[PDB]
Design an enzyme around this catalytic site. Structure first.
Site, PDB file in Angstrom:
ATOM      1  N   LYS A 112       0.821  -1.200   0.000  1.00 49.13           N
ATOM      2  CA  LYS A 112       0.000   0.000   0.000  1.00 49.13           C
ATOM      3  C   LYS A 112       0.860   1.258   0.000  1.00 49.13           C
ATOM      4  CE  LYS A 112      -4.468  -0.889   1.869  1.00 49.13           C
ATOM      5  NZ  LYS A 112      -5.659  -0.142   2.326  1.00 49.13           N
ATOM      6  N   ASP A 201     -16.228   3.675   6.352  1.00 48.87           N
ATOM      7  CA  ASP A 201     -16.331   3.494   4.886  1.00 48.87           C
ATOM      8  C   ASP A 201     -16.602   2.018   4.543  1.00 48.87           C
ATOM      9  OD1 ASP A 201     -15.114   6.343   3.740  1.00 48.87           O
ATOM     10  OD2 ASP A 201     -13.813   5.640   5.366  1.00 48.87           O
TER      11      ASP A 201
END
Length: 286
Positions: A112, A201
């Protein structure tokens, strides 16, 4: 291509100097860097060419690029034999780009690369903090037997983790039975909540479905504490996003949905205390 430690030192000097000032002037870089044969203005020209850095005009100097920051982290991870080869971009998180990487042994891991900030100074600062947050919270959650990838290593804005074999729910049109996959996502909501956290989220772009149809939380950048004055709003929003997805993707409608009154606390905080603990240990080095 061919790098050399002199070129890597000037990159680290542009980085160091970038803490203060949007643009770090040449004279201030030569000072932070140091050398023999001292050819710094030469190294800066070689770095501009490989687009690892860029020059701008207020007055007047150098900034590290996205490619430069990427290289600094990837080369540091390489030194530890955590990354030997970088692949194509295969994903995105809310504030990050996902890639597939490989160590020396040829074992594949996910990477990431965090990208946050709309100002140079706040870009390398917030992207580093965003990476610190993901490794700290994955370590804290993974230790508590939460369905998240295993945290492997961190540097700057780069987080190396277990590659989950499977696809995000947005890519899955057919499940063996939506009743079990729906309940597991709702159980993950209540589980997080029991530990004092609300995702913020919870969606089909952060949840990955494996071989035997299990869920893995991949991205959780803006979590809400259940102690928040508006926590019940955040909890329900995450619930409704799952109900909205299952109703449109598989047409699975159900009444087995949670409420904020169903939450039973345990250790909570502890998870934040554990995650804060890891962030302090990580911050101790720069």
């Amino acid at each position: 291509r061919y790098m050399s430690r002199d070129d890597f030192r000037v990159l680290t000097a542009v980085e160091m100097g970038m803490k203060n000032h949007e643009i770090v002037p040449g004279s201030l870089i030569a000072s932070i860097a140091s050398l023999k044969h001292g050819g710094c203005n030469k190294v800066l020209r070689e770095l501009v060419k490989h687009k690892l850095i860029a020059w701008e005009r207020t007055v007047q100097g150098y900034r590290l690029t996205n490619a430069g920051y990427d290289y600094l982290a990837l080369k540091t991870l390489s030194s530890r034999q955590v990354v030997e080869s970088v692949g194509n971009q295969m994903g995105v998180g809310k504030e990050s780009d996902i890639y597939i990487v490989a160590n020396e042994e040829g074992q594949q891991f996910a990477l990431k690369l965090h990208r946050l900030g709309r100002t140079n100074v706040s870009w390398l600062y917030l992207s580093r903090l965003s990476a610190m947050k993901e490794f700290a919270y994955m370590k804290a959650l993974y230790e508590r037997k939460f369905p998240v990838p295993k945290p492997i290593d961190y540097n700057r804005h780069a987080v190396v983790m277990e590659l989950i074999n499977g696809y995000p729910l947005c890519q899955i049109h057919h499940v063996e039975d939506p009743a079990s996959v729906y309940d597991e996502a709702m159980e993950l909501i209540v589980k997080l909540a029991n530990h004092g956290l609300i995702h913020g989220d919870f969606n089909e772009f952060n949840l990955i479905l494996d071989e035997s149809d299990h869920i893995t939380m991949i991205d959780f950048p803006q979590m809400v504490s259940t102690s928040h004055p508006n926590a019940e709003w955040y909890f329900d929003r995450d619930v409704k996003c799952i109900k909205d997805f299952f109703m449109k993707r598989f047409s699975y409608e159900s009444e087995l949905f949670p409420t904020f009154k169903d939450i039973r606390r345990e250790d909570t905080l502890d998870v934040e205390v554990s995650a804060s603990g890891y962030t302090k240990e990580m911050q101790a080095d720069d």
